[PDB]
Design a protein around this ligand. Structure first.
Ligand SMILES: CC(C)N1CCC2(CC1)CC(=O)c1cc(-c3ccc(C(=O)Nc4ccccc4)cc3)ccc1O2
Ligand SMILES: CC(C)N1CCC2(CC1)CC(=O)c1cc(-c3ccc(C(=O)Nc4ccccc4)cc3)ccc1O2
Lengths: 191, 191
């Protein structure tokens, strides 16, 4: 629709500059509509970012659900690499939305709640897998699974997004998947 | 001085509310000085936060330097616990400054550079220790030490500060030290 066109313009302009430096008129111009027509589809540029971030987080969540239902037939290290990769490729395919959506957590309760909701889901799934590994005798009973899951997910959020943003310091993007897989596997399976 | 009094007032008020909700007049009132007298000691409330954060980061850095020069005579797990504890206790003793200083990274190049400088120092020290452990045969040669060091430091930044801020999700503050020690030890020593 014109909705899709607003969303594509916003994602395009966020590659060039921050949300603060993009106007409703910039989004309207880019989508080939007037400013009042824009305000019919979105109440604000902030709502546009919230919708883009919702699409990215849901894309990651659905990719992870697909993997859960379709396990790779490979060793445990490659199965964890496949799962972390869902987040590497999904957020890594949408760096501008990832960056702007992380920044908006400070100023938008809706953005903070969206992020919070999905982190709780991803941590709960990670914890359930660690517990199932322990129950089948493949992983030792060390830390409480939900606490370990929490720290590993927060590590991935900070480390992936620092790499994508080219922060100083950061792990090079071409090394971050291997880095995170090593820490997940050693901390889940290590005595 | 009146400087110290401004800094104590600012740290006090940041426990109640964000920097945006604290006025120069609030800091002046709290330190028993006029607004123009305030502007003699600091150009802005933002400079006050930058100075508070500099003091906290330097306190952590000097505590770590003290430990490096005065190793605990205990096993490797307790030596890493002692070192992570420097960051747990120092930032954990200054939660309001930690929280406001992390938020200011978005809006202050000076705050971003301060944080960046010290993270590079702490990562470099972590990497040098991992290399020395590998050289003495106590740790296996797995990931590049500087990349592993980077991810472990970014994990600690995100996980400690989420715990202190009571974010949802977060590791409980009473469990975060043990959580991080487990992940550091398994990822540094694990094959
Ligand atoms: C042990 C063996 C039997 N199998 C292991 C692999 C499976 C099934 C079981 C499937 C998988 O793909 C997976 C992924 C994550 C998972 C969850 C979250 C992240 C993650 O990166 N967060 C993240 C990233 C950015 C921001 C916030 C969170 C990564 C992997 C957690 C468990 C999994 O189980
Ligand atoms: C192996 C054995 C021989 N000894 C291990 C302990 C020692 C000496 C050697 C001393 C120590 O206390 C230490 C601490 C850190 C260290 C560095 C950074 C953090 C950290 O938490 N970041 C952090 C926190 C918040 C925000 C940003 C970074 C923790 C520990 C790194 C190496 C160390 O070596």
């Amino acid at each position: 629709d014109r909705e899709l066109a607003i969303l594509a313009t916003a994602e395009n302009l966020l590659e060039d500059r921050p949300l603060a430096d993009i106007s409703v008129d910039d989004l309207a111009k880019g989508a080939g509509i007037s400013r009042p027509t824009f305000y019919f589809y979105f109440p604000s540029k902030e709502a546009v970012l919230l919708t883009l971030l919702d699409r990215v987080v849901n894309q990651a969540d659905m990719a992870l659900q697909t993997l859960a239902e379709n396990p790779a037939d490979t060793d445990r290290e490659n199965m964890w690499r496949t799962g972390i990769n869902v987040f590497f490729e999904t957020f890594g395919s949408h760096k501008a939305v990832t960056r702007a959506g992380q920044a908006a957590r400070a100023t938008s309760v809706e953005v903070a709640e969206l992020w919070s909701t999905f982190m709780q889901k991803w941590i709960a799934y990670t914890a359930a897998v660690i517990d199932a590994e322990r129950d089948r005798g493949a992983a030792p009973r060390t830390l409480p699974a939900h606490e370990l899951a929490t720290a590993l997910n927060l590590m991935n959020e900070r480390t992936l997004f620092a790499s994508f943003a080219g922060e100083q310091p950061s792990v090079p993007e071409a090394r971050v998947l291997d880095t995170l897989v090593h820490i997940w596997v050693t901390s889940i399976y290590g005595e």
